[PDB]
Structures are given as structure tokens and as C-alpha cells.
A paper describes a structure:
RbmA is a 26.4 KDa protein, with putative carbohydrate binding activity, which is found within the biofilm matrix, mediating cell-cell and cell-biofilm contacts. We found RbmA to be a two-domain protein, functionally arranged as a dimer, with a high specificity for sialic acid, rhamnose, fucose, galactose and N-acetyl galactosamine.
A thorough co-crystallization screening with various carbohydrates was unsuccessful. Furthermore, soaking experiments with a variety of monosaccharides resulted in the crystals immediately dissolving. As an alternative, a co-crystallization of RbmA with the 18-crown-6 ether was attempted. Since negatively charged glycans can bind to similar pockets, a crown ether was used as a probe in co-crystallization experiments. Furthermore, all dimers containing crown-ethers had their tight grooves protected by the O-loop conformation, perhaps due to the interaction between the 18-crown-6 ethers and Y87. Crown ether dependent protein stability was studied via 60 ns molecular dynamics simulations. Our results, however, additionally demonstrate that the wide groove is capable of accomodating large substrates. These stabilize RbmA in the closed, compact conformation, which is preferentially adopted in the crystal.
Numbering used by the authors:
A (entry chain H): 38 to 271
B (entry chain G): 39 to 271
Amino acid sequence: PVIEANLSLNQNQLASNGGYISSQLGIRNESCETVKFKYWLSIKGPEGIYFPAKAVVGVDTAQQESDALTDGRMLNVTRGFWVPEYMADGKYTVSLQVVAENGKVFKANQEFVKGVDLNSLPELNGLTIDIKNQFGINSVESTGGFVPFTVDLNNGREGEANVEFWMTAVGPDGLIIPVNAREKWVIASGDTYSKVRGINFDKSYPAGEYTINAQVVDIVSGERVEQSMTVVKK
Amino acid sequence: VIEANLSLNQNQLASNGGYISSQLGIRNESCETVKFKYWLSIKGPEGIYFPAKAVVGVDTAQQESDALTDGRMLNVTRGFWVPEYMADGKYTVSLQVVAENGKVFKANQEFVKGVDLNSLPELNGLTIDIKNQFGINSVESTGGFVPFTVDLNNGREGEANVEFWMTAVGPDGLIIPVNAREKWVIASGDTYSKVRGINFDKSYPAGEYTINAQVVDIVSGERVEQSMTVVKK
């Protein structure tokens, strides 16, 4: 019982004043028997924003209904959503999510930005943050694995920058795993805090999805900025 | 297998932040000797997640394993700073133990910063009251229904314009709609009051679901959150 899910956005790039985004959802039953499943469209944004794409004028009373697909058949839906002005500027993730009757989870994600450039590194006002999965390693075995991350904090400002920086891995069973302890830094003008920092996914760590999350706070302004990568333990 | 506790010397920090000293207890209740890894992590508002542990230099350490004799208990004092620049609001401290066999054990305490302990989140007179109606903290693998009471009380002298929604953030990257995005004009002294439940379908994966409600003031742009945790066995 395998489902194939895709998602595409008619646009990636919203200005600060927000806007409308029209999406195209594709759900294909690649299996031989007929398949029942639930699906929905959800948005995840900065500052712990999580919201459903779906909006209603009245009182939301609906429960999550099941759907179905004929053998080899595909569902095709257009779905649009507003992203209002009052929502935080930053990087957003739209997620088509399918839960099949058998427990298997399938997803398709697209990103968009609001009030910043699609290509751009997160920044604290000249101080740019560059965190990357160094070797494109997107999973580790049940028996364990090591994934290294490159960390580059570049002070583009004309003055010194005072920052606190840390990393966690948010994962199953409510786990928040320290990846990098809280570090305080004075970074001089034009200078760079640059290093490699890895996480060892111990054999004993539970199977599932780990969200590798890095944060940087400007100690003076109080602006906080994030970057995230996903690693799955099989 | 493992018994974990956590207590805080302080629950209540002012806006200018402060220091919190914690006491970690880890007890091996098992008959054989047990190996495990453990750590201390903080979760706050606005998607804040940070490790309790801080270093002045370059963090270079790896997550070391520990061990406990049969019936033996580990006892550690561990403190952490919560600086002024961190967001005001409700925080969760979490002692987390991962045993060599895969079993996860936790002990959580809450604290607040710049607001009263157990106070209702508010958007400036507009108070938000979301509660697990019947104290149901888990559902069986075969499924279950958990209802939530929702009370949005406009204490202001003028009308309040809000947008409101709910999700359940859970395993395998799932963000499950619990309440669609609703726009509301709430008159002075009035209440948006209702019950809203989530059906944890048999098919939903085992694990930890974070029931999350958010309210935005459309005029000010202030956003406020309330969260409750439900585990599917």
C-alpha cells in the first residue's frame, strides 16, 4: 500500500504585506488494491508558527474525513491559502501530508518566503547565518550514524556583533537533543565564526524524524533567527 | 527500567531573566545493570528550543553514555541561565533519558518569564483559555477522542479582532489540523466559547502529539499560544 504525494506552489515569494498562494496537490495510488487515506495541508513558519492552510468563515466543526483511491488512480486538487500581513516575516514550509489507513505517512513539502529573498541566508541585520548538512546525508540506519554540519556565522556589519548560538535536534517521543551547547560570542567586524559540528545518532536513539535546528540570538537587539534541516533515523 | 525526576529551585523569572538551579534524579529500578544517555533541554515560546548546558568556548563534546548499578540512583545538580533577551512567556524544562535499549524516560518542570505562573496567555486584556477538558493525557493504539475547551474572553473596553486556530504537532513530521483558521470580531466583555475535540484515529502513528492553539490580534499583530500534550500509545 504505497501512496505518491506531490505539491507545487504557484509562487514562492511573498512581500511583507503578505499574499495569496495557490497550490496544486497530487495524490496517486501506486498500489494494486484500493486504498483509503486521510490527508491535509499544513503550514509551518518562523517563531513556532503552525497553521492549517484551510480557513473557514463560520465555526470550524469538521473532523478529519477519510478519502479513497481506485487502483492506479490519482487525486488532483487545487488548494489556495492566504498568508496575511500580520504573520511573521521569514521562511515557511508548506506540507502536503497523507496518512494511509495502514499507518504509513507520506509527505510533499514546498517552501516559500515572506518579506525576505528566497535565496537568502537567515540574518540578524548584516550578521548572516549559514548552517548546512555538509554531505547531504538525509538518514541514518537503526544501528546509528554520524551526520556533520557546517556552521558559518558571518558578521557583515561595520561594528562588532554579540550573539548567543545553539543547536538542538527535535525528534520523537518529545526528545530535544542537544547538538550544540549555548555559546556566547563577540564577533568582530567582517570576522567569521566558522566550524564543523556533528551529531552522533546513537543506536539507542528512537526511530523517526529528527529536526536539526540551529538558533542565533543577537544579545543587544534581541532578534532571533533560525535554520533547520531534517534527518530521519530508520 | 529507569526512573527520572526533575525539580526547580525557581519557577518564576522576571522579564530581565535569571538563574535557575535544578536537581536531576536518575534511578535504575531494574535488576541488571543499565547503560543510558541523558541531558537537559529547554523549550520556550516562539519556537524556542535550547539546551540547558552552556559553554564559554567552543562546544566540542559528544553525548557520552552513563551507567547505573542495580537499584542505584544518579543525583546531579544542574543550573542554567535564562537571559533577559529570551522571549517572555511559558517555558518547559525537560530532563530526558535515553536508555541503551531505546526506551525514553522524561521528567518535566515548567517555569515562566515576565508573566505569572499558571496565568492565562493574553493579548492585552483579551485572555485565552484552552484546556484539556477531562484531563485525558493519552489514547490507546486503537484510537481515542480528546475534547478541548476553548474560551477567548475579551476583557478590553473595546472590540477585539482576532484570528484563531489549532493544530496537533506529532510524529513523522505530522502537523494535524485540529481547528481551521477562524476570524472573529469579539465585542467588549464578550466571550468566544466552545468545545473542540480531536479524534486520534487508529491509523495515526504512536508517539507524542503537541496540541497547539494560537491566537493573533489582527490589529496589533501580537500572537499568543497555548499548548497541551497528548501521547498515542
